[PDB]
Amino acid sequence: RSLPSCKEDEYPVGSECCPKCSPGYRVKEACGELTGTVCEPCPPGTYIAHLNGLSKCLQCQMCDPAMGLRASRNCSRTENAVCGCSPGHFCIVQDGDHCAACRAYA
Amino acid sequence: SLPSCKEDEYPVGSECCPKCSPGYRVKEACGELTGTVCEPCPPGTYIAHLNGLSKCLQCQMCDPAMGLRASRNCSRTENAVCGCSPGHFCIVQDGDHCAACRAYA
Amino acid sequence: SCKEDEYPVGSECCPKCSPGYRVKEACGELTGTVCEPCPPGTYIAHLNGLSKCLQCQMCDPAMGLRASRNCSRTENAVCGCSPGHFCIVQDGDHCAACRAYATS
Amino acid sequence: SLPSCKEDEYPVGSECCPKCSPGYRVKEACGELTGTVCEPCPPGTYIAHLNGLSKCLQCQMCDPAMGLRASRNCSRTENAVCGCSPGHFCIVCAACRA
Amino acid sequence: RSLPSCKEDEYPVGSECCPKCSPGYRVKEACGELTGTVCEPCPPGTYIAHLNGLSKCLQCQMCDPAMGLRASRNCSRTENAVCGCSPGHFCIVQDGDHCAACRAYA
Amino acid sequence: RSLPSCKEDEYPVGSECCPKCSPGYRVKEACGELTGTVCEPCPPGTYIAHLNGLSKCLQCQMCDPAMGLRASRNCSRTENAVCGCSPGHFCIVHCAACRAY
Amino acid sequence: EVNPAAHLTGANSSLTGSGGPLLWETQLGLAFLRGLSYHDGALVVTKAGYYYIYSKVQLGGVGCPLGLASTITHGLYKRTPRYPEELELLVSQQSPCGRATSSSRVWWDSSFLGGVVHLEAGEEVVVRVLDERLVRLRDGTRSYFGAFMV
Amino acid sequence: VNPAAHLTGANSSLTGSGGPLLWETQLGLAFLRGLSYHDGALVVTKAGYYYIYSKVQLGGVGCPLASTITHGLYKRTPRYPEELELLVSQQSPCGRATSSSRVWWDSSFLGGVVHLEAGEEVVVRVLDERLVRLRDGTRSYFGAFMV
Amino acid sequence: EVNPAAHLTGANSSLTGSGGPLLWETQLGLAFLRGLSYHDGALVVTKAGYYYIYSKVQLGGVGCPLGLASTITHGLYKRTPRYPEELELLVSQQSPCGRATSSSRVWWDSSFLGGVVHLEAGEEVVVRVLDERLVRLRDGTRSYFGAFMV
Amino acid sequence: EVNPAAHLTGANSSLTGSGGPLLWETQLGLAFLRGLSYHDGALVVTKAGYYYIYSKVQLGGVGCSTITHGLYKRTPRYPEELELLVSQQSPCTSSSRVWWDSSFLGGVVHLEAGEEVVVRVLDERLVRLRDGTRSYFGAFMV
Amino acid sequence: VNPAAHLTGANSSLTGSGGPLLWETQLGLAFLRGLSYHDGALVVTKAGYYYIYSKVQLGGVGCPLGLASTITHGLYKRTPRYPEELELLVSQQSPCGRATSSSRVWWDSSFLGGVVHLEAGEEVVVRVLDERLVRLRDGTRSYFGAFMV
Amino acid sequence: VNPAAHLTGANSSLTGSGGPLLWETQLGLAFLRGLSYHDGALVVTKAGYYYIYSKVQLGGVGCTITHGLYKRTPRYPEELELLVSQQSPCSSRVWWDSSFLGGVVHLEAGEEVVVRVLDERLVRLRDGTRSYFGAFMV
Ligand SMILES: *[C@@H]1O[C@H](CO)[C@@H](O)[C@H](O)[C@H]1NC(C)=O
Ligand SMILES: *[C@@H]1O[C@H](CO)[C@@H](O)[C@H](O)[C@H]1NC(C)=O
Ligand SMILES: *[C@@H]1O[C@H](CO)[C@@H](O)[C@H](O)[C@H]1NC(C)=O
Ligand SMILES: *[C@@H]1O[C@H](CO)[C@@H](O)[C@H](O)[C@H]1NC(C)=O
Ligand SMILES: *[C@@H]1O[C@H](CO)[C@@H](O)[C@H](O)[C@H]1NC(C)=O
Ligand SMILES: [Cl-]
Ligand SMILES: [Cl-]
Ligand SMILES: [Cl-]
Ligand SMILES: [Cl-]
Ligand SMILES: [Cl-]
Ligand SMILES: [Cl-]
Ligand SMILES: [Cl-]
Ligand SMILES: [Cl-]
Ligand SMILES: [Cl-]
Ligand SMILES: [Cl-]
Ligand SMILES: [Cl-]
Ligand SMILES: [Cl-]
Ligand SMILES: [Cl-]
Ligand SMILES: [Cl-]
């Protein structure tokens, strides 16, 4: 038992669905009866990775050099940053499928 | 990158055809006049997103010999999820979820 | 001012419910304390004026514990060691944890 | 059953071809030309002997997580060799505990 | 070329300035257009070490004997207690100004 | 309604049936309209224990001394080696392995 | 007039092991809902606004569970139909036991978080703990999840 | 006026007597606004739902009785003859310390919303009480406000 | 009659290393201000009264600068023109490496505090941690600083 | 010129416990048959020739002797199954400890039309089925 | 020309990023014949059935801290037909634990192969759950390949 | 005809001489089709890309194995490692473990591939079904 919902490409505004914004953009203004959804791109240091109805982009994660990490991919509008070992370091602590701390070679 | 289809489409040859809903696989690809023909995933299988797949994803089984049962059954749009059998508690973890339970002594 | 078997509700002194029973409706000047039994998994051990029963504790098998006394409407559950386990930390009458006997 | 070529050549089809010096691979095999053309191994590879190889051999990497560093670097004529990092001792060199 | 401000011995009250109270005293009533700041002494157990416009005094710190500590200086209305080691104890960690914990001599 | 089939002592060749070969022999050449199944003995190291239509014999098993095993019965063209413990050795796990006292 | 509030308590079914959120008791004992509702582990907002949300989980164990990750999270998450993934709101990362922890003694550690977040109507908040084997349920007083509009 | 209180750890704060912690109600940061206090307890005057909270600072110069600490909030009500547990935490700092003789510190925080009738009381307890490290009222404290 | 509230989130600017307080994000992601302001790390009160203030800081590291000697202080402090010094409000001490060994160096721990305090118009609250090197910033969900009027 | 190929996947009916071979899924998901057939666990050859055959089985359990994992030919030319490619593995402990271990075998064998290949594992209870990706059986003509 | 490839372990193979392993494509034993490569993936040009395979060498001194109870090595498809990777062939291993003597070297090699259907533009990648277990050498011990059948 | 071969462990398979493993080429399941054999080596005739494979059954009664495929070529005076695995085998218990590898390599006419196992004593030969070595062109 679920309630009726919007499509995988839409999102609720009041009692109706509006179209979702593309990855990399957030909602600036909702549908009216005769206005499309107005999307605006994510500001620096934020991202949204999927189609969305979010009013605020998601904050990108920082990669901490003090933990031996650097970004192996930089934050972009559509994608969070991802962390890897700094040069001269190897991974010594794992968090699920990815590295969380690296150690400097002796 | 390369030129790509919109989110609700997938590539057929050098063109793009509309995707099928969650729970449905592609039975027949779209032509110019004719839309995508879709068909529901058979029992034991699922597809959770808009998709252009010809074959559904197989649902996982929850192994009672590992002290588990489905806490959520397989359905057309969703995989089964495993939890402890009654009278068992979680002893092994795989990431965020339980991989084995032990019977009470 | 309320005696032993009563308790204060607004301006009134109301009769208490028995063990195993909760106050569903407080007494008014004109209508009595309405007592209802605690539902399963809860208890109240004394004469009381509680609107809600106390939740019974669960004995944790992962700590080597089982119920040596089940929860009833008047009594909390008590925990002791599971079979093949012995106490390593003791509380009042029960354990807080048991470990298993090693084997060869 | 005899080799196709004398020791200092190698077979390439019907023909027997001159070899290439250590650090060099065969860029252009003998054929119409009686002779071989050799070119340097690219970085990260080596070849240690007279050869008729079209591709150089990959240098090994010395694994820091195993307590190893290169005591001899990889060059075109020689593979890297691994030995302990500072403060470690060989346990097997293939691994080094501190 | 600065901007005007309360004097060191005054503090803000709306867009006005009122005189501060003395050490060991707190404000009981603010100053008014005729009236001065009304000050009252800090009750025991508390202090204020400087000219202030505080409504409440500051709580004196206790020196914890279980931490091998004792007062070098009792609290007073104008000064906080200072803690140092008890007889038969040496300081094992400083906290900058003062000592945080002491151990016996066996 | 059962279905037709080679006899017990014959084996399928194409759409037809040829006689099997004796234990210890393999089919060198399939039977023909005028010619019998041509069979030939299994070379040493191999066996076949039953009538058969095999083009190759089964390889005999070796009994591994290093596992404390000897042949109790040697391999032959018609039966496989069988392993048991060597002298000064008793079975742990046919025995798949044996210990020295 | 009625300010939305709730307090939800650990219960026999709180730890599903399914990779899903914790579940909670909503009616018995100390649990209540006032102007919020509950659905599969979530507080469901009916009146939009800013809410202080909080959760406590009691951790502990005899020794340390096998295969335990180095890092464990206890966090509050938002579910919204505006995004097909949960949004992290408030999260703590802890390393409560490991290799060096003695197999034989009992340890206890409690994790509390709180904070104010903005929630629309129909949005939800859930609690997750990465490895539920560390959660020590008792009687609803050691692990819980609540909120109130501010 | 919405009731609220913040009470600070006190010279008196530990009776040692099997009674609850004691708190300061007027000096410094401490205050009562539309709640009362009596023998360690916040005493409710206006019935309703309250967020209650407490922080206690634990610590020691090494570790000598019980390795397990309980820090709790509890209700005293004429409706029941025992105190009822509301919100409780357990901590183990000495049990798992790598050195028995090191100085250590650990802070225990809890809060939550509970329903309280007029005349009902909330107290704070810690066992063993000797792990509580008092200073100046900034590290151990006890408060509430109606929500 | 809007009730003042705020939630500010750990940021890339968050740790000055200047011996000044932590700074915080105010506008992006989950951060917001309602009827409060911000100044140089400080929540600045407009409307006088009693505020529940709170902060969480996420700590962690690969070993500690001082071994088993390492101590952390995490606090909330008032800055007021009525006094020329910052005043301690709510403070915690932790021994973050206390369970660590050389072969178990990597650790994580969160510190949370909250409490109700009186703030006049123009007064400020800031968060300070010593030693800032143990603060592990991520994406604003692990360290944060907030308040609301009660 | 269509090259026979197949890949068959672990299924909930895979472990019959009857002493017979494992069974497999042939159509759904990642499973298919191209110029080969299937019958009661067996890949059945239509086109005679040399096939690379392969199987993976995922083994594992919580706590707990020898496991055997094999591919076998059934042929009308002999009243018994012929062992083709076989592996032995030791199982397994804390009885609170999970272990896992995958067994892979592959090789090229000659198969006539109408001959069959099956997979067997002893003891079947140590096989950990999941979703068709962990235990599988296939072949192609080379 | 039948598509075929063998890619080999390299110094950039282990990114620690939660992405797939990366591979050498040109040097030494590595090559591409009628298949392409992109960010770790073998990219298919000619649609059909492919035997795909991978070997990863695991090993260590001791066991990495916080190692999970279940480690996977697998082959996964990326396709524009679905927004997630699809698992094709995966193994679960439990290579070492907290009991493992931190005073000695263990090794264990994981191999898998199978036939899958791939369309033009689909991609296969290799993942290992915990890259700290993977002992790169010179391309002979960890690798990833495919050929059309 | 597409070259292919499958060779089976046999009584002579372990020389104990520091040379490669030897194998059976004609009996039982063994065969050669467009490949030849020479002292343990599969010998290529038609040049191109081959999937090569080998399985070795390891085992013992109580107690680092390397198992490898190698190229011999007059293009270089040492064997070249192609595909290699390391395994930690092993007090007083019986154990078994099987090592499998495969991969695609380029082989020229006249070039050879062999299989080595160190320590050879750990190989448990049985009847050719458990240790083998093969290849086919792709
Ligand atoms: C990310 O950003 C910095 C500049 O801020 C640049 O130097 C660096 O190379 C970039 N890293 C990657 C992986 O692209
Ligand atoms: C999943 O399926 C089984 C079989 O029909 C059903 O009986 C069971 O109720 C389901 N489990 C749950 C939790 O719904
Ligand atoms: C407690 O109740 C359970 C539930 O039926 C029962 O099975 C168990 O034996 C009881 N234990 C005792 C000690 O009475
Ligand atoms: C503080 O007061 C006590 C008793 O009133 C006295 O004995 C003590 O010496 C005083 N300490 C100092 C340092 O002045
Ligand atoms: C089997 O054959 C061997 C080798 O010729 C011989 O020495 C031995 O005595 C025979 N043993 C048995 C049991 O047949
Ligand atoms: Cl939003
Ligand atoms: Cl598909
Ligand atoms: Cl399907
Ligand atoms: Cl009540
Ligand atoms: Cl109740
Ligand atoms: Cl070459
Ligand atoms: Cl005061
Ligand atoms: Cl045959
Ligand atoms: Cl609880
Ligand atoms: Cl204090
Ligand atoms: Cl953060
Ligand atoms: Cl499976
Ligand atoms: Cl490698
Ligand atoms: Cl064999």
Numbering used by the authors:
A (entry chain J), E (entry chain K): 37 to 142
B (entry chain D): 38 to 142
C (entry chain L): 41 to 144
D (entry chain F): 38 to 129, 135 to 140
F (entry chain E): 37 to 129, 134 to 141
G (entry chain G), I (entry chain H): 91 to 240
H (entry chain I): 92 to 155, 158 to 240
J (entry chain B): 91 to 154, 160 to 187, 191 to 240
Sentences from the paper on this structure:
It interacts with a TNF ligand, LIGHT, and immunoglobulin (Ig) superfamily members BTLA and CD160. HVEM engages in bidirectional signaling, serving not only as a receptor but also as a ligand for IgSF receptor signaling. To dissect the molecular basis for multiple functions, we determined crystal structures that reveal the distinct HVEM surfaces that engage LIGHT or BTLA/CD160, including the human HVEM–LIGHT–CD160 ternary complex, with HVEM interacting simultaneously with both binding partners.
The asymmetric unit of the hHVEM–hLIGHT crystals contains six independent chains of hLIGHT and six independent chains of hHVEM, which form two classical 3:3 TNF–TNFR hexameric assemblies with threefold symmetry; a single 3:3 TNF–TNFR hexameric assembly is consistent with SEC analysis. The hHVEM ectodomain is composed of four cysteine-rich domains (CRDs), while hLIGHT forms a compact homotrimeric structure. In the hexameric assembly, CRD1, CRD2, and CRD3 of hHVEM engage hLIGHT via surfaces contributed by two adjacent hLIGHT protomers. The two independent hHVEM–hLIGHT hexameric complexes exhibit similar overall structures with a root mean square deviation of 1.8 Å for 742 aligned Cα atoms. The hHVEM–hLIGHT recognition interfaces are highly similar within and between the two complexes, and the following discussion is based on the hLIGHT G and H chains and hHVEM J chain. The structure of the hHVEM–hLIGHT complex shows that HVEM CRD1 and CRD2 domains interact with the DE, AA′ and GH loops of LIGHT, while HVEM CRD3 interacts with LIGHT CD and EF loops. The interaction between the hHVEM CRD2 and hLIGHT DE loop appears to be important for hHVEM–hLIGHT recognition, as it contributes multiple potential polar contacts. The main-chain amide group of hHVEM A85 (position numbered with initiation codon = 1) forms a hydrogen bond with the side-chain hydroxyl group of hLIGHT Y173, consistent with the behavior of the Y173F mutation in hLIGHT, which significantly diminishes the binding of hLIGHT with hHVEM. hHVEM N88 does not directly contact hLIGHT Y173 but is relatively close, and the hHVEM N88A mutation attenuated binding to hLIGHT. The hHVEM M98 backbone amide group contacts the backbone oxygen of hLIGHT R228, and the side-chain carboxyl group of hHVEM D100 forms two polar contacts with the side-chain guanidinium group of hLIGHT R226.
